[PDB]
Design a protein around this ligand. Structure first.
Ligand SMILES: *O[C@H]1[C@@H](O)[C@H](n2cnc3c(=O)[nH]c(N)nc32)O[C@@H]1COP(=O)(O)OP(=O)(O)OP(=O)(O)O
Ligand SMILES: [Zn+2]
Length: 635
RNA sequence: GAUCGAUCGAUCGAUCGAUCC
């Protein structure tokens, strides 16, 4: 039921101006949006109709908003619908927009329509409600819609422009250090959304924090393990592996010049990636031994990266989980190739496993971080035996490691697997939320806490400055509410004018396409895949090959997670068709009725014909060549 | 295919996670 708390938030928006209203709850925002929609559709006299649009960022929240708006708007006779990726396939979105009032289509669909030509002007709507409007920062679909709105407004042909009332929970600080930078960031966010009012609770503070999270911070600084026997063995393995890898690459220490790297860190992973990308561009004129050298170097770098990931897992999660990860990687990589390099690496890993398994089964090598985690979990479940806990981790490789640790450790039997009846839920990013644990990560049931287990004071300082940023953001919101609506309007107008100017400035013209007929080669094999003359672009995003020689140059493999995205339908993945390469080259899809193995320029190296330099790109946008459109009349 | 956030490294690059088409 609409109470005074919702009316205080909805009042500054019913006048007819955009707002940056922010509520710490979700049901409050939903109810406020409902009342705003009602007051906007009921204020229009006879002869006019409303076209309020709601922008949901995710599919679950989209379905929730669609259900709520369909259940609420049943006695008013309003056409409420919604479009998504599984709905805008061969459907007249223009007829849906023109024959409905409360459409809840996604922002990406509206951006694609504005780019294609459908819905030319943004003045057809009369009310825009951007859910979670704090994402309007850079290159966002919300930001693209706002750029279109500003281009239509400041361009001099602004017609019946709709309201741009937003809806978020936290305004956000970003990277602000002092109050002035926070105020500048908030003003830039408000000008990007083109709003002069920031509605928030200022009078009804009595009933605000009744259903508010209100968390508690319980930072616990822990130290790492000292008995790094497993780490020592893995470091010796990586050391002799890098030593025997320099037999073919004498300049391996000069390909990446950053600093002295240590095993078990992210800097070592970056060094591995850099030396891999630097050795993948070898130009030996033999073209037969170069392939073997590149394959051996790729195998060496992949094994080193897997060892580094195992070291990171053993440092963060348990040791047996890292050993199981290594064994699983070696089992999955053994059935692929049987060459001398892989056989030597596998036999060395098997020789070291006889001691690795003995070190892993030693009960005196338990991580103290997991020890204090188990201790605090036990004390929290002894305080209350009905706590639904959530455990955030950095990398997904720990979501199963901690799950196996919970299932195996006998000191905690009240827990249940919660990989994302379920007691603890081990996830990575985002119910009851009775307790949150940030294990090296940087709601309801009032009385919840938030533990921060970390072996570094850097995360503690980051959380402290984040709390300070939240406080100064609240202060800046208060200061902006103190200001008037006129000077704020002039300020946001100047800010958005400068934004439009700098945006029109950074407009790179069409680059000269490389008329040469360069070719593409595999990453870990350096085999001739296809020339650029046989590469056809479909919709300025996807690239495919239609040659007949390339059709037998790959092998198919069943896709573990197939899904269609508005243009194709997945069928399988494509891999390199060589002796023991099995490298990912792309994915097999169907556009309308044919079958196309669309490849990615990331897993390829570009070699010229005239010069011969082996270039390496990451995205198709960086590859500047003659992009011939895919014509279905050929094949 | 694009976007976002975090970490790291030389205005850019790598990894991770999430989102959409
Ligand atoms: O070039 C990309 C891209 O064209 C295509 N692709 C795969 N999924 C999508 C999608 O959801 N939406 C769009 N627009 N394009 C998609 O795959 C090419 C790259 O192949 P990848 O193996 O890297 O991607 P894939 O989905 O096959 O596997 P993964 O990256 O998720 O692990
Ligand atoms: Zn290959």
């Amino acid at each position: 039921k609409p109470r005074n708390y919702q009316l205080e938030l909805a009042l500054p928006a019913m006048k007819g101006k955009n707002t940056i209203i922010c509520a710490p709850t979700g049901c409050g925002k939903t109810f406020v949006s409902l009342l705003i929609c009602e007051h906007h559709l009921k204020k229009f006299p006879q002869g006019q109709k409303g076209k309020v649009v709601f922008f949901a960022n995710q599919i679950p929240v989209y379905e929730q908003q669609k259900s709520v708006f369909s259940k609420y708007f049943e006695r008013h006779g309003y056409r409420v619908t919604g479009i998504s990726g599984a709905t805008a396939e061969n459907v007249p979105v223009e007829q849906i927009v023109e024959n409905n009032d409360i459409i809840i289509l996604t922002p990406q669909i509206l951006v694609n329509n504005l780019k294609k030509g459908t819905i030319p002007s943004l003045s057809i709507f009369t009310l825009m409600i951007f859910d979670e409007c704090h994402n309007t920062s850079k290159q966002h679909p919300y930001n693209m819609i706002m750029f279109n709105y500003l281009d239509q407004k400041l361009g001099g042909s602004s017609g019946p422009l709709p309201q741009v009332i937003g809806l978020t929970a936290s305004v956000g600080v970003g990277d602000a250090k002092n109050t002035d930078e926070a105020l500048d960031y908030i003003c830039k966010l408000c000008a990007s959304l083109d709003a002069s009012v920031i509605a928030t609770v200022k009078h009804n503070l009595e009933e605000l924090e009744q259903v508010v999270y209100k968390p508690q911070k319980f930072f616990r600084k822990v130290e790492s393990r000292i008995s790094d026997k497993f780490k020592y063995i893995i470091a010796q393995l990586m050391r002799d592996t890098e030593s025997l890898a320099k037999r073919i690459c004498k300049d391996l220490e000069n390909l990446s010049q950053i600093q002295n790297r240590e095993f078990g860190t992210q800097k070592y992973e970056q060094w591995i990636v850099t030396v891999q990308k630097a050795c993948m561009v070898f130009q030996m004129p033999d073209k037969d031994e170069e392939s073997r050298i590149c394959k051996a170097l790729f195998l060496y770098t992949s094994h080193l990266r897997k060892y580094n990931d195992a070291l990171i897992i053993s440092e963060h999660a348990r040791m047996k989980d890292a050993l199981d990860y290594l064994k699983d990687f070696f089992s999955n990589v053994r059935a692929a190739g049987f060459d001398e390099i892989e056989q030597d690496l596998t036999q060395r890993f098997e020789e070291k496993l006889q001691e690795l398994e003995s070190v892993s089964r030693d009960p005196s090598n338990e991580n103290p971080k997991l020890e204090d985690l188990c201790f605090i979990l036990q004390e929290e479940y002894h305080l209350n035996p009905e706590t639904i806990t959530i455990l955030f981790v950095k990398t997904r490789a720990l979501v199963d490691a901690l799950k196996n640790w919970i299932e195996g450790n006998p000191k905690l039997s009240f827990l249940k697997p919660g990989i994302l009846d379920h007691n603890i839920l081990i996830a990575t990013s985002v119910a009851q939320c009775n307790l949150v644990i940030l294990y090296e990560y940087v709601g309801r049931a009032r009385g919840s806490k938030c533990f921060l287990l970390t072996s570094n004071a850097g995360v503690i300082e980051k959380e402290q400055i984040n709390m300070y940023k939240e406080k100064m953001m609240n202060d800046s919101i208060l200061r902006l509410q103190t200001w008037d609506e006129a000077v704020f309007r002039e300020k946001i107008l100047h800010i958005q004018t400068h934004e439009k100017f700098i945006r029109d400035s950074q407009e790179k013209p069409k680059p000269v396409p490389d008329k040469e007929n360069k070719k593409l080669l595999c990453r870990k094999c350096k085999a001739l895949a296809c020339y650029t003359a046989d590469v056809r672009v479909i919709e300025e995003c996807h690239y495919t090959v239609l040659g007949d020689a390339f059709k037998e140059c790959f092998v198919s493999r069943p896709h573990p997670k197939p899904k269609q995205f508005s243009s194709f339908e997945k069928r399988a993945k494509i891999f390199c068709a060589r002796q023991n390469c099995s490298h990912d080259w792309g994915i097999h899809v169907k556009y309308k009725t044919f079958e196309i193995p669309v490849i990615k320029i990331e897993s390829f190296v570009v070699e010229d014909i005239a010069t011969g330099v082996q270039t390496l790109y990451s995205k198709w946008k960086d590859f500047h060549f003659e992009k011939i459109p895919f014509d279905p009349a050929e094949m």
